[PDB]
Amino acid sequence: TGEVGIEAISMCTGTNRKLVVNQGINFVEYPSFIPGSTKPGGCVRLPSFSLGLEVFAYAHAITQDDCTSSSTPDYYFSVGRIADHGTDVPVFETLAEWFLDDKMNRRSCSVTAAGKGGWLGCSILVGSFTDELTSPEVNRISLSYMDTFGKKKDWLYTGSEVRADQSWSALFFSVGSGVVIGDTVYFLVWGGLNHPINVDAMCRAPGCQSPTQSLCNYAIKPQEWGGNQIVNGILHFKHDTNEKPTLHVRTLSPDNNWMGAEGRLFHFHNSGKTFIYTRSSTWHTLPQVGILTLGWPLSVQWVDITSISRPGQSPCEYDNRCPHQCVTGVYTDLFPLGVSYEYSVTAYLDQVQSRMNPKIALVGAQEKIYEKTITTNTQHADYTTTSCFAYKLRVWCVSIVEMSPGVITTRQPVPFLYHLNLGCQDTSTGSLTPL
């Protein structure tokens, strides 16, 4: 197993060069590494998946509701490896598992594969998330470590232990995975600020002639949540499997971001590039994807993608381009396949307002390159997260999709595994050069 050569994919651009999908996607049949639920009713949701240099880490929440309440979830947390069983199909071997059923009310957890194990970052909530956003005291968070030998750590933090550049009223992990760079673990987080940063919101609106700056400013201060600025941040700590890690939080200024939201970090060691995705929760319904600079302060070079969107409640439905005051949308991340996020693959929901019609799609900046319907166009589905890797000189992707209905639950994540057969096509002649 290795990382995708996104530099080589980026070179497949220019005159009489077109990135294409040689062969239709075919989903592999294998025993799923995502456990099902055993209690009638309820919901399995919020999958988090990280593929590291040595292991993968996975987690999801199990609730006894219809995926909408804030009842106390149980969490499943596992660490495994991509194994060699003598064929071209990668094999997901689970090595250590942890059923976190302690009723601590861990919320919005993300995983990060680090070395021979994984980190699980969660928010501990006592009440509702709106109550947490209003109250000036920040919620507690937990960090759990598990390696392939079954060694486990579980650390709890109050806000007074977190070295933050700002005073947050609430701190939630991003659901999507974080990354490790060298010896440091990085998580994307989001939450509310006690004292707003006095700058104008970003107001980056491709396809809107005159975006109203005032509407952009109100969008990041939803009144239904107490009117605080909702921001993203980066939580990082030096990887430590013995001592309690020392946590640092940096805030992404609202002039370089849309409303703070769930999202994901990606990192490629060969090119050194770090990428960021965030959920399109407001008026900006196009993908929010960029190159992240982990400096002081943080800065994101955002990349305009217009080929796809996500379902949302009107006026912030699929493909809406102009600012409004709305909170809707869905997490459907895009795995970067180019050094500038110009190519990516994703499981997205091709629907205007309803959450249905999930499709795998390879997309460029302007248009979709290839797409495949997962089941039917009336299929209900919700959150999706996609990860790609090199296995025996081929690009493989796993797209974990919250499919609805589950067998006995409202939702159930399914890990779709497929060879992504990319080729560079000379459009003057039709001849292909495989990647």
Place this chain on the structure above:
Amino acid sequence: TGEVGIEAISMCTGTNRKLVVNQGINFVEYPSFIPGSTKPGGCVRLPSFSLGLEVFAYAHAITQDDCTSSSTPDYYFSVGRIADHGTDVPVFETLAEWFLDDKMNRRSCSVTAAGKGGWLGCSILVGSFTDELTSPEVNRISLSYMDTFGKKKDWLYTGSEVRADQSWSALFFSVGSGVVIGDTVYFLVWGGLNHPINVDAMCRAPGCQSPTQSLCNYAIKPQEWGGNQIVNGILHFKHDTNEKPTLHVRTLSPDNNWMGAEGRLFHFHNSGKTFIYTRSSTWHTLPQVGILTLGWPLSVQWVDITSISRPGQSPCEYDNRCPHQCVTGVYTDLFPLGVSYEYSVTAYLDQVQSRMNPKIALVGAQEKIYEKTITTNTQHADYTTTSCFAYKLRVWCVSIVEMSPGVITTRQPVPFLYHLNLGCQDTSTGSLTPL
């Protein structure tokens, strides 16, 4: 972990004594040990589950159809243990897994937990099963062993290697689990005889005013299958994890059985009792349960149970009592809770012809003692297999139910786990004595 004390449960009978369920069944939420499928449109079915003295063994078939075709399945096979994680809820810990995607066309497999490992018995078919039943050469069978370290054995047998008391045209494993007694592994098998045993069919029809012996004789030689006598048998061998075991088959005489069918063996080491269940595939829609004597020849002391039945096509639908010529029904085994099968627990389908309304039920000979609807009464479901055991001085049962529809498949087995809170009620006053 230990076997249920069915001797103590049997004593809860007689004057002013009534076996009761103290508290309604409650389904436990835990990470399922049964993997889901990852390829849209398939089918996961035929679960086999065996809980032994040290380990459990599990297997199911994955097909790319609607569970009705005879396409070549992939098989999942796992070995694990009931673990103690410091709570009263038993924990199913998977220790070794084997994805048998070898395209060998293994059919109708059963598992048996044996020592620190498990045995998987399968039939190797070249064509359809009806062609196999007619053809005088018996199909090949395979025996696979896997231990908790993942070390694997895979043995192939032709008919000339099997020491059988009769000439079988076809030999299928029972889907339901076998048992190990001492040093010998026992599997229930069913199939066709080349030359029928010249005896009258059993014709045990509780609730039938005039059972016609001739119709009973026609029932075990269905013409749609080539008209051979369909029988059950016992396949056994000395447990050997190094050399190829030597197989022996004994036939159960047709005067001591209904039509040969899928089924299951149970064994309790404390009482030395061996029990048998077979699927009610023909006119006799009442449970087929008895005490098995492993002598030469085999004999079963059948037990009349009239409280429950199974859905089937008319004239052999739910609760039919009179002999007919039909092949229908469904596998829904009953785990014995008394030394004479007078008490048992099962997941059964409460419906006349359709396969729906699965319910957990504790039953006696004449009446149901307690029952619980798993989800709703419009829920589709098919095969079910139930196993009960003692965990920390309480009776726990796992009922694996083919629930329909799955998340992306036609069927998906779900292992429902529940405390079976039995009590002996003194009926003059209501006072209880816990078991």
